[PDB]
PDB file of N, CA, C and O in Angstrom:
ATOM      1  N   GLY A   1     127.735  74.255  11.687  1.00 54.61           N
ATOM      2  CA  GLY A   1     127.209  75.288  10.761  1.00 54.61           C
ATOM      3  C   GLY A   1     128.106  75.474   9.555  1.00 54.61           C
ATOM      4  O   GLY A   1     129.328  75.499   9.693  1.00 54.61           O
ATOM      5  N   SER A   2     127.494  75.623   8.380  1.00 55.20           N
ATOM      6  CA  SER A   2     128.227  75.743   7.113  1.00 55.20           C
ATOM      7  C   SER A   2     129.370  76.778   7.164  1.00 55.20           C
ATOM      8  O   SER A   2     130.500  76.447   6.802  1.00 55.20           O
ATOM      9  N   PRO A   3     129.111  78.038   7.618  1.00 53.95           N
ATOM     10  CA  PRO A   3     130.134  79.108   7.636  1.00 53.95           C
ATOM     11  C   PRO A   3     131.401  78.750   8.420  1.00 53.95           C
ATOM     12  O   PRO A   3     132.427  79.419   8.284  1.00 53.95           O
ATOM     13  N   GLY A   4     131.332  77.704   9.234  1.00 52.19           N
ATOM     14  CA  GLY A   4     132.483  77.309  10.027  1.00 52.19           C
ATOM     15  C   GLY A   4     132.463  77.926  11.408  1.00 52.19           C
ATOM     16  O   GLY A   4     133.460  77.895  12.127  1.00 52.19           O
ATOM     17  N   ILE A   5     131.324  78.495  11.768  1.00 52.05           N
ATOM     18  CA  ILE A   5     131.147  79.096  13.079  1.00 52.05           C
ATOM     19  C   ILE A   5     131.005  78.018  14.144  1.00 52.05           C
ATOM     20  O   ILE A   5     129.951  77.400  14.279  1.00 52.05           O
ATOM     21  N   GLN A   6     132.080  77.766  14.874  1.00 48.09           N
ATOM     22  CA  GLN A   6     132.055  76.782  15.946  1.00 48.09           C
ATOM     23  C   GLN A   6     131.180  77.268  17.092  1.00 48.09           C
ATOM     24  O   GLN A   6     131.471  78.288  17.718  1.00 48.09           O
ATOM     25  N   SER A   7     130.103  76.545  17.344  1.00 48.03           N
ATOM     26  CA  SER A   7     129.152  76.920  18.373  1.00 48.03           C
ATOM     27  C   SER A   7     129.669  76.596  19.771  1.00 48.03           C
ATOM     28  O   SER A   7     129.217  75.650  20.416  1.00 48.03           O
ATOM     29  N   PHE A   8     130.623  77.384  20.217  1.00 44.02           N
ATOM     30  CA  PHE A   8     131.115  77.300  21.582  1.00 44.02           C
ATOM     31  C   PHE A   8     130.190  78.101  22.489  1.00 44.02           C
ATOM     32  O   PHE A   8     129.348  77.541  23.193  1.00 44.02           O
ATOM     33  N   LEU A   9     130.331  79.416  22.437  1.00 40.34           N
ATOM     34  CA  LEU A   9     129.423  80.321  23.119  1.00 40.34           C
ATOM     35  C   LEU A   9     128.516  80.960  22.076  1.00 40.34           C
ATOM     36  O   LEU A   9     128.650  80.658  20.889  1.00 40.34           O
ATOM     37  N   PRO A  10     127.564  81.824  22.470  1.00 39.88           N
ATOM     38  CA  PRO A  10     126.782  82.593  21.502  1.00 39.88           C
ATOM     39  C   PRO A  10     127.698  83.371  20.555  1.00 39.88           C
ATOM     40  O   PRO A  10     128.783  83.797  20.951  1.00 39.88           O
ATOM     41  N   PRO A  11     127.281  83.556  19.292  1.00 38.73           N
ATOM     42  CA  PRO A  11     128.096  84.224  18.254  1.00 38.73           C
ATOM     43  C   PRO A  11     128.403  85.698  18.549  1.00 38.73           C
ATOM     44  O   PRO A  11     128.899  86.420  17.682  1.00 38.73           O
ATOM     45  N   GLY A  12     128.095  86.139  19.759  1.00 37.93           N
ATOM     46  CA  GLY A  12     128.443  87.479  20.178  1.00 37.93           C
ATOM     47  C   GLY A  12     129.503  87.464  21.261  1.00 37.93           C
ATOM     48  O   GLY A  12     129.928  88.514  21.743  1.00 37.93           O
ATOM     49  N   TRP A  13     129.926  86.267  21.643  1.00 37.74           N
ATOM     50  CA  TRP A  13     130.932  86.097  22.679  1.00 37.74           C
ATOM     51  C   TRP A  13     132.271  85.721  22.065  1.00 37.74           C
ATOM     52  O   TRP A  13     132.361  84.785  21.268  1.00 37.74           O
ATOM     53  N   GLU A  14     133.308  86.448  22.437  1.00 37.89           N
ATOM     54  CA  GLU A  14     134.634  86.204  21.904  1.00 37.89           C
ATOM     55  C   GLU A  14     135.577  85.734  23.004  1.00 37.89           C
ATOM     56  O   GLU A  14     135.913  86.495  23.910  1.00 37.89           O
ATOM     57  N   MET A  15     135.987  84.477  22.936  1.00 36.11           N
ATOM     58  CA  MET A  15     136.952  83.951  23.890  1.00 36.11           C
ATOM     59  C   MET A  15     138.371  84.251  23.429  1.00 36.11           C
ATOM     60  O   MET A  15     138.815  83.779  22.383  1.00 36.11           O
ATOM     61  N   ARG A  16     139.067  85.060  24.205  1.00 34.29           N
ATOM     62  CA  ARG A  16     140.451  85.379  23.923  1.00 34.29           C
ATOM     63  C   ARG A  16     141.330  84.806  25.018  1.00 34.29           C
ATOM     64  O   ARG A  16     140.944  84.790  26.185  1.00 34.29           O
ATOM     65  N   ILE A  17     142.495  84.315  24.651  1.00 30.90           N
ATOM     66  CA  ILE A  17     143.393  83.745  25.635  1.00 30.90           C
ATOM     67  C   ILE A  17     144.368  84.797  26.131  1.00 30.90           C
ATOM     68  O   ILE A  17     145.339  85.135  25.449  1.00 30.90           O
ATOM     69  N   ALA A  18     144.090  85.321  27.318  1.00 30.77           N
ATOM     70  CA  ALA A  18     144.939  86.329  27.929  1.00 30.77           C
ATOM     71  C   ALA A  18     146.333  85.769  28.180  1.00 30.77           C
ATOM     72  O   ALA A  18     146.496  84.557  28.349  1.00 30.77           O
ATOM     73  N   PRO A  19     147.358  86.639  28.220  1.00 30.10           N
ATOM     74  CA  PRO A  19     148.747  86.230  28.489  1.00 30.10           C
ATOM     75  C   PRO A  19     148.883  85.464  29.805  1.00 30.10           C
ATOM     76  O   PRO A  19     149.883  84.782  30.044  1.00 30.10           O
ATOM     77  N   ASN A  20     147.863  85.584  30.651  1.00 27.17           N
ATOM     78  CA  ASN A  20     147.802  84.867  31.922  1.00 27.17           C
ATOM     79  C   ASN A  20     147.746  83.365  31.682  1.00 27.17           C
ATOM     80  O   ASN A  20     148.151  82.573  32.528  1.00 27.17           O
ATOM     81  N   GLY A  21     147.236  82.984  30.516  1.00 25.94           N
ATOM     82  CA  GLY A  21     147.056  81.585  30.199  1.00 25.94           C
ATOM     83  C   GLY A  21     145.606  81.167  30.311  1.00 25.94           C
ATOM     84  O   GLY A  21     145.261  80.014  30.061  1.00 25.94           O
ATOM     85  N   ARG A  22     144.753  82.117  30.678  1.00 25.74           N
ATOM     86  CA  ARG A  22     143.342  81.838  30.895  1.00 25.74           C
ATOM     87  C   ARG A  22     142.488  82.410  29.771  1.00 25.74           C
ATOM     88  O   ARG A  22     142.594  83.594  29.444  1.00 25.74           O
ATOM     89  N   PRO A  23     141.667  81.562  29.138  1.00 25.28           N
ATOM     90  CA  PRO A  23     140.626  82.007  28.207  1.00 25.28           C
ATOM     91  C   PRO A  23     139.634  82.940  28.885  1.00 25.28           C
ATOM     92  O   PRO A  23     139.036  82.585  29.901  1.00 25.28           O
ATOM     93  N   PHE A  24     139.467  84.127  28.338  1.00 23.16           N
ATOM     94  CA  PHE A  24     138.482  85.052  28.857  1.00 23.16           C
ATOM     95  C   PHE A  24     137.486  85.410  27.770  1.00 23.16           C
ATOM     96  O   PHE A  24     137.852  85.627  26.611  1.00 23.16           O
ATOM     97  N   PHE A  25     136.227  85.448  28.145  1.00 21.74           N
ATOM     98  CA  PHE A  25     135.153  85.660  27.202  1.00 21.74           C
ATOM     99  C   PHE A  25     134.678  87.090  27.257  1.00 21.74           C
ATOM    100  O   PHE A  25     134.122  87.548  28.258  1.00 21.74           O
ATOM    101  N   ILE A  26     134.931  87.795  26.181  1.00 18.70           N
ATOM    102  CA  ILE A  26     134.505  89.156  26.062  1.00 18.70           C
ATOM    103  C   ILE A  26     133.237  89.225  25.208  1.00 18.70           C
ATOM    104  O   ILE A  26     133.207  88.786  24.055  1.00 18.70           O
ATOM    105  N   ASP A  27     132.174  89.722  25.814  1.00 18.25           N
ATOM    106  CA  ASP A  27     130.883  89.808  25.153  1.00 18.25           C
ATOM    107  C   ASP A  27     130.820  91.069  24.302  1.00 18.25           C
ATOM    108  O   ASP A  27     131.189  92.149  24.756  1.00 18.25           O
ATOM    109  N   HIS A  28     130.373  90.931  23.064  1.00 17.83           N
ATOM    110  CA  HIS A  28     130.331  92.061  22.152  1.00 17.83           C
ATOM    111  C   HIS A  28     128.921  92.638  22.045  1.00 17.83           C
ATOM    112  O   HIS A  28     128.659  93.495  21.202  1.00 17.83           O
ATOM    113  N   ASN A  29     128.015  92.169  22.896  1.00 20.05           N
ATOM    114  CA  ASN A  29     126.655  92.686  22.927  1.00 20.05           C
ATOM    115  C   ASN A  29     126.576  93.878  23.868  1.00 20.05           C
ATOM    116  O   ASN A  29     126.207  94.983  23.470  1.00 20.05           O
ATOM    117  N   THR A  30     126.940  93.640  25.117  1.00 21.13           N
ATOM    118  CA  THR A  30     126.946  94.673  26.136  1.00 21.13           C
ATOM    119  C   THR A  30     128.360  95.211  26.319  1.00 21.13           C
ATOM    120  O   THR A  30     128.554  96.345  26.764  1.00 21.13           O
ATOM    121  N   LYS A  31     129.332  94.372  25.942  1.00 20.38           N
ATOM    122  CA  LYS A  31     130.760  94.683  26.036  1.00 20.38           C
ATOM    123  C   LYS A  31     131.262  94.504  27.460  1.00 20.38           C
ATOM    124  O   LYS A  31     131.571  95.476  28.152  1.00 20.38           O
ATOM    125  N   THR A  32     131.332  93.257  27.896  1.00 21.78           N
ATOM    126  CA  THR A  32     131.889  92.936  29.196  1.00 21.78           C
ATOM    127  C   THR A  32     132.935  91.844  29.074  1.00 21.78           C
ATOM    128  O   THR A  32     133.038  91.172  28.046  1.00 21.78           O
ATOM    129  N   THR A  33     133.688  91.675  30.134  1.00 20.70           N
ATOM    130  CA  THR A  33     134.822  90.758  30.140  1.00 20.70           C
ATOM    131  C   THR A  33     134.763  89.795  31.326  1.00 20.70           C
ATOM    132  O   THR A  33     134.940  90.204  32.473  1.00 20.70           O
ATOM    133  N   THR A  34     134.503  88.527  31.054  1.00 21.70           N
ATOM    134  CA  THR A  34     134.458  87.517  32.103  1.00 21.70           C
ATOM    135  C   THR A  34     135.429  86.378  31.799  1.00 21.70           C
ATOM    136  O   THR A  34     135.664  86.053  30.638  1.00 21.70           O
ATOM    137  N   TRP A  35     136.010  85.784  32.833  1.00 19.90           N
ATOM    138  CA  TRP A  35     136.869  84.625  32.645  1.00 19.90           C
ATOM    139  C   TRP A  35     136.037  83.363  32.726  1.00 19.90           C
ATOM    140  O   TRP A  35     136.282  82.386  32.023  1.00 19.90           O
ATOM    141  N   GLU A  36     135.054  83.403  33.605  1.00 20.83           N
ATOM    142  CA  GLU A  36     134.229  82.248  33.893  1.00 20.83           C
ATOM    143  C   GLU A  36     133.293  81.948  32.729  1.00 20.83           C
ATOM    144  O   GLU A  36     132.499  82.800  32.329  1.00 20.83           O
ATOM    145  N   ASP A  37     133.413  80.740  32.192  1.00 21.54           N
ATOM    146  CA  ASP A  37     132.607  80.301  31.054  1.00 21.54           C
ATOM    147  C   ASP A  37     131.119  80.318  31.414  1.00 21.54           C
ATOM    148  O   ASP A  37     130.672  79.575  32.286  1.00 21.54           O
ATOM    149  N   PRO A  38     130.339  81.182  30.746  1.00 21.26           N
ATOM    150  CA  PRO A  38     128.910  81.352  31.028  1.00 21.26           C
ATOM    151  C   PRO A  38     128.081  80.114  30.687  1.00 21.26           C
ATOM    152  O   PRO A  38     126.924  80.006  31.085  1.00 21.26           O
ATOM    153  N   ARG A  39     128.677  79.169  29.970  1.00 21.66           N
ATOM    154  CA  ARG A  39     127.977  77.954  29.580  1.00 21.66           C
ATOM    155  C   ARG A  39     128.203  76.858  30.611  1.00 21.66           C
ATOM    156  O   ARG A  39     127.732  75.731  30.451  1.00 21.66           O
ATOM    157  N   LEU A  40     128.931  77.201  31.669  1.00 23.04           N
ATOM    158  CA  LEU A  40     129.156  76.284  32.781  1.00 23.04           C
ATOM    159  C   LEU A  40     127.898  76.180  33.636  1.00 23.04           C
ATOM    160  O   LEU A  40     127.788  75.318  34.512  1.00 23.04           O
ATOM    161  N   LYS A  41     126.958  77.076  33.377  1.00 26.90           N
ATOM    162  CA  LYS A  41     125.674  77.073  34.064  1.00 26.90           C
ATOM    163  C   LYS A  41     124.567  77.370  33.067  1.00 26.90           C
ATOM    164  O   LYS A  41     124.875  77.989  32.028  1.00 26.90           O
TER     165      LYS A  41
END
């Protein structure tokens, strides 16, 4: 996409790397926090 939006997860999902060393995906639609990549299924 032109804007540079890397289509990893939906544009409402924010993957942050917790100090644990694990990427966690925080959804900004409902506002939840999951470690497990929702695109794995």
